[PDB]
Amino acid sequence: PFQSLVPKAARGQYSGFVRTLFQQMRDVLGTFDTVQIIKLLPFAAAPPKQSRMQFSSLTVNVRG
Amino acid sequence: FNKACELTDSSWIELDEIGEDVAPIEHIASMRRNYFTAEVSHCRATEYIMK
Amino acid sequence: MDMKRRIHLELRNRTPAAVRELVLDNCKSNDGKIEGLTAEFVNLEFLSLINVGLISVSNLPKLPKLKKLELSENRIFGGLDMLAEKLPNLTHLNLSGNKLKDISTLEPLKKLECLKSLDLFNCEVTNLNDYRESVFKLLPQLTYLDGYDREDQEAPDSD
Amino acid sequence: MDVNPTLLFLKVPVQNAISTTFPYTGDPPYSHGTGTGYTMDTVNRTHQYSEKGKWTKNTETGAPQLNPIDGPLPEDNEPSGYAQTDCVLEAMAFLEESHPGIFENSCLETMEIVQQTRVDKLTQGRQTYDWTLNRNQPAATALANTIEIFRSNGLTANESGRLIDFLKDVMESMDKEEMEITTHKKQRLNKKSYLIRALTLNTAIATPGMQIRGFVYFVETLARSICEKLEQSGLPVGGNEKKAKLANVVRKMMTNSQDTELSFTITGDNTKWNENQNPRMFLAMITYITRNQPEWFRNVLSIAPIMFSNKMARLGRGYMFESKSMKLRTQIPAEMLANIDLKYFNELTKKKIEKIRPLLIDGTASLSPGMMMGMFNMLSTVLGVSILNLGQKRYTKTTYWWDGLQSSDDFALIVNAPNHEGIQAGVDRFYRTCKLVGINMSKKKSYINRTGTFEFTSFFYRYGFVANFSMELPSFGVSGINESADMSIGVTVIKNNMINNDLGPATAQMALQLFIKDYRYTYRCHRGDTQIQTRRSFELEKLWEQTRSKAGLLVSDGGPNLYNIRNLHIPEVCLKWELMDEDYQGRLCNPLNPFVMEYDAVATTHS
C-alpha cells in the first residue's frame, strides 16, 4: 500500500538508492540508526533501479 | 513544438491538496487528475507556463 | 597548411608507430576527405579532426587502437558505416556541428561493440521529438549521449 | 518524430476530440474587428445588399433611407435583403395555424408584464449610449442622466416608477421643440438634433441609446414568450436543456425513417444575418402578432421597429495617420470624414468613404436597410422557426419535408426524403423559401451529411452523444472581496459551472487545486506544516501548535482544505464544524469581533 503513494516514475530509483544506503549500514561496522531504518524502509519494496543521484527528499503523494 | 512536447529533469507545477475521496466518481476523477499531473508536472510546456 | 604538411609537422621526427595522440584541427581536406594519414599509424588512440573541411570519412585509415575520435565542426552528411570496421575499438565519438539530419544516418554506429559517448550537438537531428530516447534505443550500448546518461545526470569526469 | 497533434484524429473521431480545435478558453488579448473602418464597411454592405430598393428622404431626421421590402426578387445566389411582406405574413400565419393561440397567449403574458415592470429593470444591462454626452456609460448612469434631464425639461411621469411611464416620457420628449441638457455645461438641442441623438447607435458592435432600450425590452419580452412555446427555437434555453432539443429533433425525423427514406442533416449558418433583417419587416410581423389586441399594446410594441428603421449610426473613433518620414502620429475624428480630402487613405478605405459619404448626416450615417447585431436576437429566431415550420409535410404538399432547429444565425436542418433527388429538392425549397423573408443561407459555411452527426451552436452531436463547448472556462481565481467571501465564491463558481457548462470531475478538481493555490498566495494563509515564510506565518504557526483537531482549521487560518466534488455546495465554516475545537469555534465566531447565489456563506472573524 505504501508503494501506491510513491510516484511511479521515480518509484524504482528510490528503492535502489535506499537499498544501497542500507547496505552501507551493514558493511561499515558500528553505524546503525534505527530511526533511519524505520523511516526509509517502506521506500525499498519495489524493483530497484540503479542511478547516480543523491536524493535529498523522497516524495509521496497524499490527497493530490 | 517538438522541444515543447518533451520531458525535463524538474517538477515545475506544485499543486495543493484536495479533500478526501469518498464518492466513486471522486475516485475516478482523482485517478484521472493524478495520472495527468504525473504526465505533465515534469515537462517543458509547464516550464513555459510558469516562466 | 593542409593535412599532409601538418601531419609531418606533428610527426615531430617521431615514427608513426610511436604516436598515441595526434591532433589535426583546422588544417584542410584534399577536397572533402582525409589525406596524409596511413595505416602505419598503429599506436594512435586519440585523433582530433576538428574544423577540417571534411565532406566524408570514406578514406579514413585503419586504426585498431583508436578510442577517442572527434569530427566536430565538419560537414559530414553520412557515410559513417566506415568508422565501424575501420575503428573497432572506438569508444568516444564527437559528431557535433555536422550536417546529420536523420536517425537513419546513425544506424551504422549500432554495430560498434564498445561505445560510451556520442556528442551530437548543433545537428539538425537534435531538433526531433523523443530525440535522446530514439538514439538510446538505436544505439543500446550507449551510456552517455551529448554528456548525460539517461536521467539527465552529467557524465562523471575522468573519462 | 515530428509531433503532429492533428494526426490524433486518425484514431479518435473528430467530435470526440473536438475540444482540441478550440484555441482559447478566455477572451484573447487582441481586438478582432472594430473602429471606423469596420463600421463604414458594415454600412456600405448593408446598403449594397438592398441597392435595388426605394430611396426616400426622412422628413424629420433628414437623411436618405433605403426601403428594399417588396423589392425585386433575387436573381443570383448572393445575399439580398428584399424581404417580401406577403411571404413573411403568410409564414407567420402558418406558424399561428400550426400552433393555435400561441400569439394570443404570448400577447396576454407580455401585456401583463408591461403594466408591472419597473424602470429599475432598465439598468440591469450593459454599456449604453448617453445621448446627453455622446459617449458610452454603464446602464445605471445612463438611466440616471436621462431621468434627470427629463425632469429638468418638465417631463416627470417616470416618477411613477413604471417603465411604461418612462416610455411615455420618452415619446413626449421626442415631441418637444427644444431639449436643455445641463451637465454637472449648458447646451440646447433643437428638435432635429435631439431626434438624431436619440436615433443613434455608438460603437455586438453597437449599443442603443436609452430611448430605444425601453421598447426593445418589451419587444424582446414578447419574442421570448413566443420562443418558449416553439420546440424549434433553441435561443431561450441553455445548458443541459439545450442538449435535449438536439436529441429530440433527431428522434422526430428518425422515428420511422427506415423504409428507404433517406435522411440528411444540413449544418448551416446564415450569412450576414444582421445585415439583411429589415426592421420594417419586424414591424410587419409585430403588427400581425398583436392583432385583435388593445391599441395601446400594439402602439407600445410597434415603436422599437419604427425607431430602428430610422436609426442612424456613429462611425466610430476615427482614423490615425502616420508620417514615417517626419515621425508624426495624428488622428482624424470620424466627424471630419465628410470633407477631408481622399488622398491620405488607401484605396479600399477611399472607396468605403466615397460610397458612404452620401449617407452622412450630422456626423452619423443612416442605416435604415438592416438591423445591427445584439438587438432583436429573439425576435429574429421567430422568423427562422416560422420558416422551419413550412416543411411540416402539410405545407410542402410533396414527398420531401424538412424540420430542424434554429438559434438566430445558427441552424441544423433535417431533410428526410424518399431518394437523393427528393433531398436535393427539399434543400432547394428551403434555400428559396428562406430567401423570400430576407434570410440568406451561407453556402461557404454549411454542409450536408447523412443524419446521425451535426453541429448546432457548438453543441456537437454524434450518434447520440452531445459535446457542449459553447461556453468558456470561467476565471478560477480569488474574487478579491475578503478571506471569507472569496472561498464561498470560488467554490460556488466551480459547482454551478459543473452543473451548467459541462465540466469534468477531474478538471473540476484541478481547478479547485489552482483556486486554493491562488487563495493561499493572495491572503498569506499557507498550511501550518508548509514552511513558506511570510509576515503572517508566525501567527499561523502558533495557532497550528495549540489546536488539537488541526483538521478543523479554516483554509484561511492555515488549515487543511477539505473540498472535493461531493461537498462543493457546503460553506467552509459549516463543513469544518464538528472538527473545530470548541474554544476555536468561540474565538472565530465571537460576536465581539473588532473586524466584522452570490457569496452564500457564514459570517466569521475573517469578513
From TrEMBL, chain B:
Signal peptide: none annotated. Belongs to the influenza viruses PA family. Influenza RNA polymerase is composed of three subunits: PB1, PB2 and PA. Interacts (via C-terminus) with PB1 (via N-terminus). This is Polymerase acidic protein. It comes from Influenza A virus. The lineage of its organism: Viruses, Riboviria, Orthornavirae, Negarnaviricota, Polyploviricotina.
From TrEMBL, chain D:
Gene3D superfamilies: 6.10.140.720. Its EC number is 2.7.7.48. It catalyses: RNA(n) + a ribonucleoside 5'-triphosphate = RNA(n+1) + diphosphate. Residues 50-82 are annotated as: Disordered. GO terms for cellular component: host cell cytoplasm; host cell nucleus. One of its GO terms (molecular function) is RNA binding. RNA-dependent RNA polymerase which is responsible for replication and transcription of virus RNA segments. The transcription of viral mRNAs occurs by a unique mechanism called cap-snatching. 5' methylated caps of cellular mRNAs are cleaved after 10-13 nucleotides by PA. In turn, these short capped RNAs are used as primers by PB1 for transcription of viral mRNAs. During virus replication, PB1 initiates RNA synthesis and copy vRNA into complementary RNA (cRNA) which in turn serves as a template for the production of more vRNAs. Pfam families: Flu_PB1. It is an enzyme of class 2 (transferase). InterPro entries: RNA-dir_pol_NSvirus (IPR007099), RNA_pol_PB1_influenza (IPR001407). GO terms for biological process: symbiont-mediated suppression of host gene expression; symbiont-mediated suppression of host mRNA transcription via inhibition of RNA polymerase II activity; viral RNA genome replication; viral transcription. It comes from Influenza A virus. Residues 250-447 form the RdRp catalytic domain. Keywords: Eukaryotic host gene expression shutoff by virus, Eukaryotic host transcription shutoff by virus, Host cytoplasm, Host gene expression shutoff by virus, Host nucleus, Host-virus interaction, Inhibition of host RNA polymerase II by virus, Nucleotide-binding, Nucleotidyltransferase, Phosphoprotein, RNA-directed RNA polymerase, Transferase, Viral RNA replication, Viral transcription. The gene is PB1. This is RNA-directed RNA polymerase catalytic subunit. It is found in: Host cytoplasm; Host nucleus.
